[PDB]
Amino acid sequence: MKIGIIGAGQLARMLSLAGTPLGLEFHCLGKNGDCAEEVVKTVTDIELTKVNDVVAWAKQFDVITFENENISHELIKAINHEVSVYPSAKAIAISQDRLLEKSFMQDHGIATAKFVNIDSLAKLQSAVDDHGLPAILKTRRFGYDGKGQFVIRSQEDITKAWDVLKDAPDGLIYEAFVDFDYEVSQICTADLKGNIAFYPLARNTHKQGIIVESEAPFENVVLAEKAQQIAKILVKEFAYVGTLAIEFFVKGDELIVNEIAPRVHNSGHWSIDGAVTSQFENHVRAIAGLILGDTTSRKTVMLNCIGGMPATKDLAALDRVKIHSYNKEPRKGRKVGHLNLNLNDETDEYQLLQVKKLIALSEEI
Amino acid sequence: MKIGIIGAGQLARMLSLAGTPLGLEFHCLGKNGDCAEEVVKTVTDIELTKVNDVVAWAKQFDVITFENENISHELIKAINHEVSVYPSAKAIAISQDRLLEKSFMQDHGIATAKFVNIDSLAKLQSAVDDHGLPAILKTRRFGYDGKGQFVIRSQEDITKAWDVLKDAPDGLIYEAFVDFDYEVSQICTADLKGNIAFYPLARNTHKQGIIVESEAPFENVVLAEKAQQIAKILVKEFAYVGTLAIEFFVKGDELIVNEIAPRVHNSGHWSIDGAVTSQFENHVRAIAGLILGDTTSRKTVMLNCIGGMPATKDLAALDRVKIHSYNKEPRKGRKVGHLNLNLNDETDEYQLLQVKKLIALSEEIAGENLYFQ
Numbered sequence: 086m087k088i089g090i091i092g093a094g095q096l097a098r099m100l101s102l103a104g105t106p107l108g109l110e111f112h113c114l115g116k117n118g119d120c121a122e123e124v125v126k127t128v129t130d131i132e133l134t135k136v137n138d139v140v141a142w143a144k145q146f147d148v149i150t151f152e153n154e155n156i157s158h159e160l161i162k163a164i165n166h167e168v169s170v171y172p173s174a175k176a177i178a179i180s181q182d183r184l185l186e187k188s189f190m191q192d193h194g195i196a197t198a199k200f201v202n203i204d205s206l207a208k209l210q211s212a213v214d215d216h217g218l219p220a221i222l223k224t225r226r227f228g229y230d231g232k233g234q235f236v237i238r239s240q241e242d243i244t245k246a247w248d249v250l251k252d253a254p255d256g257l258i259y260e261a262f263v264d265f266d267y268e269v270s271q272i273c274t275a276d277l278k279g280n281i282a283f284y285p286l287a288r289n290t291h292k293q294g295i296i297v298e299s300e301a302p303f304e305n306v307v308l309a310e311k312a313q314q315i316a317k318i319l320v321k322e323f324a325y326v327g328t329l330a331i332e333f334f335v336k337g338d339e340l341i342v343n344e345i346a347p348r349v350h351n352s353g354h355w356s357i358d359g360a361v362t363s364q365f366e367n368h369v370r371a372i373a374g375l376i377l378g379d380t381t382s383r384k385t386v387m388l389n390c391i392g393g394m395p396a397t398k399d400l401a402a403l404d405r406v407k408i409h410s411y412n413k414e415p416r417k418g419r420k421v422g423h424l425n426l427n428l429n430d431e432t433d434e435y436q437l438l439q440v441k442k443l444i445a446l447s448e449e450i
Numbered sequence: 451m452k453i454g455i456i457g458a459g460q461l462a463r464m465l466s467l468a469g470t471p472l473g474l475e476f477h478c479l480g481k482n483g484d485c486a487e488e489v490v491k492t493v494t495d496i497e498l499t500k501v502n503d504v505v506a507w508a509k510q511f512d513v514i515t516f517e518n519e520n521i522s523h524e525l526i527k528a529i530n531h532e533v534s535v536y537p538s539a540k541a542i543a544i545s546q547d548r549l550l551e552k553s554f555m556q557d558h559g560i561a562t563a564k565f566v567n568i569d570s571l572a573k574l575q576s577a578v579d580d581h582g583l584p585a586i587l588k589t590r591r592f593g594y595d596g597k598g599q600f601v602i603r604s605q606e607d608i609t610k611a612w613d614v615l616k617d618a619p620d621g622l623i624y625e626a627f628v629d630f631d632y633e634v635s636q637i638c639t640a641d642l643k644g645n646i647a648f649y650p651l652a653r654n655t656h657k658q659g660i661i662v663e664s665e666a667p668f669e670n671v672v673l674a675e676k677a678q679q680i681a682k683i684l685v686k687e688f689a690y691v692g693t694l695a696i697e698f699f700v701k702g703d704e705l706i707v708n709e710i711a712p713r714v715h716n717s718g719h720w721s722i723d724g725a726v727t728s729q730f731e732n733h734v735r736a737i738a739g740l741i742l743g744d745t746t747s748r749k750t751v752m753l754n755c756i757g758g759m760p761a762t763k764d765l766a767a768l769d770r771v772k773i774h775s776y777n778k779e780p781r782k783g784r785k786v787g788h789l790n791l792n793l794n795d796e797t798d799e800y801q802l803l804q805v806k807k808l809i810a811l812s813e814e815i816a817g818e819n820l821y822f823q
């Protein structure tokens with residue numbers, strides 16, 4: 086069986102690393118010299134606006150998936166008529182636009198921040214009038230790592246936020262500021278028949294809008310049950326196949342959906358070394374029409390390497406640390422790898438402190 | 451850092467799968483179409499007898515290793531004048547020839563089968579006269595998965611064995627049958643300084659001369675200590691860098707060396723899913739000059755897929771089984787994949803029984819001899 090992946094970045098790289106032992110063959114649409122190239126059969130560089138060329142490429146294979154939900158859902162629909170793509174064009178359309186995403190949650194009784202579509206300064210003033218400060222003005226599309234956002238903390242900031250973000254061609258959303266204690270994510274995988282394999286919750290640490298740490302299992306049965314029930318709604322309504330990621334704000338026993346990603350996600354990277362079947366192996370099993378792997382998990386912390394990464398010789402000296410370099414060119418803010426560590430004892434805690442020392446030296450956000 | 455591997459088969463494939471997350475780049479010398487191709491940066495097909503061309507290929511990279519010790523040690527010596535190769539040409543020269551291997555062990559007081567170099571029928575008759583039947587005649591070089599052997603049980607078998615094997619250009623060895631209870635292997639990895647990371651013993655089951663199952667950790671403190679001491683001697687004598695495998699026959703509390711392989715080995719494949727750092731990741735760390743990874747292990751069974759392999763859908767349905775297909779075309783006796791399973795509870799034991807049933811349906815071994823004792 087041949088699997089095509091739209092994108093040749095680190096998610097594609099890790100999908101192939103996980104799926105290749107299953108005896109599957111991987112092909113990417115992307116740039117030669119992107120980091121998945123050395124671990125897949127072929128990489129083909131086709132401009133995504135050339136729909137017919139993309140469809141022709143995809144038809145060479147048995148099933149297609151993608152690493153970035155910002156791609157055209159109309160493109161996915163065109164491919165999916167000729168060869169299966171998972172997950173769905175609907176999941177892409179909804180997840181890639183903050184307003185559509187929030188409206189979808191609202192329609193299905195799923196809690197989120199209060200939100201308003203913003204198409205003018207007057208509309209923004211009304212939103213602040215209706216829903217209050219503090220608040221965040223965000224681009225509806227293409228935001229990542231907290232980019233394209235302006236936190237409004239005063240009346241004065243309203244005009245300032247509008248002036249900064251008004252020219253976003255795909256529009257803007259007002260979000261009420263959520264007072265939460267911490268953040269967690271639910272990753273799960275759904276197969277062709279709608280069966281879902283759940284991972285435990287992971288608690289995620291952010292700095293300057295970028296995830297820097299993720300730790301699982303976050304043990305809280307009330308929260309886990311709520312997160313699973315939300316995931317079940319999304320899987321059903323999207324007719325979803327593959328790994329799905331849901332990010333939440335937590336306030337006490339209350340879960341508030343922040344956003345979703347219809348793909349393997351940074352907050353599940355711990356599962357490479359902490360679950361019987363990682364989020365990557367399970368995404369591949371799902372789309373390949375295979376039964377999902379067991380997801381029994383053990384305590385694991387994942388640390389991101391942003392803007393740089395410690396020298397391999399220094400990492401290797403911490404002999405329990407599992408190294409995941411993506412072999413990417415370092416640049417400010419760029420995710421170039423991560424480190425996983427199972428946490429069982431004091432030696433593990435020591436190695437974790439050492440990893441943190443090294444990351445402090447290499448990080449550039 | 452760029453690592454060149456001589457060979458593009460499943461061992462190279464698994465070295466790259468293990469080493470690529472460390473940020474290392476892999477290149478193979480082998481045939482395009484070989485199973486490592488899809489997981490390495492490049493594969494280059496050069497005839498190994500073309501020494502200058504091989505050396506030129508190797509000099510592109512920062513360190514070289516190899517997946518098959520049957521290659522020319524003189525080739526490795528030539529490469530190593532200009533780019534580091536691990537492990538050493540000495541390890542290759544000794545390990546690749548059954549007579550040199552046995553003689554090395556004998557010279558270091560390490561127990562082996564009784565053995566005799568066989569270069570004529572008369573020499574074989576004398577070996578039988580001196581050491582008895584049953585016995586095995588084996589090629590000194592190129593043997594693997596039991597190939598190049600003839601088990602001698604009767605007087606009439608003596609001439610047959612000689613006639614089947616006598617054309618081997620690199621000669622033959624007689625071995626007396628060893629009285630043993632079961633077989634274990636010691637896999638370990640040595641770094642540039644001489645530190646050794648040890649795996650627990652694995653207990654290995656063979657059928658018709660090919661390994662079919664491997665289970666670790668095999669707990670026996672007395673045997674494990676003896677195996678480690680033997681490994682230490684070999685690492686020191688070979689100035690060894692990389693993963694090393696030693697196969698033993700066990701009789702009570704005694705270890706008899708069967709043979710060694712200067713490489714990752716089939717009996718260590720369990721470590722992909724049963725150790726903190728697999729034999730493959732550790733081989734890569736060793737040759738790359740890195741500190742070795744922790745080898746803390748958990749109970750795991752490895753089952754080989756020979757000839758054929760069960761359908762992926764059937765394997766995936768046993769949801770704790772870890773699938774390692776090499777993506778190789780089925781052929782009688784060919785190793786086309788393996789399966790690993792951690793064993794902690796009754797559900798694991800159930801999945802183990804079910805996966806063994808699937809393997810019994812897919813297996814096609816190319817057996818040539820029976821080794822019952």
Ligand SMILES: Nc1ncnc2c1ncn2[C@@H]1O[C@H](COP(=O)(O)CP(=O)(O)O)[C@@H](O)[C@H]1O
Pocket residue numbers: 198221228229230231232260261262263264268291294343344
């Ligand atoms: N409505 C809100 N109220 C409070 N904090 C928020 C918020 N929206 C986002 N944040 C904070 O800013 C971080 C990044 O926000 P987003 O998840 O919207 C940015 P991105 O990951 O899509 O690029 C969140 O993880 C959260 O800590």
Ligand SMILES: Nc1ncnc2c1ncn2[C@@H]1O[C@H](COP(=O)(O)CP(=O)(O)O)[C@@H](O)[C@H]1O
Pocket residue numbers: 563586593594595596597625626627628629633656659660697708709821
């Ligand atoms: N001298 C001996 N006495 C008894 N059994 C032997 C033996 N030599 C080999 N065997 C049996 O045949 C199996 C394969 O033999 P080898 O290890 O020599 C074959 P290979 O792996 O080098 O191709 C051994 O694992 C062992 O079960």
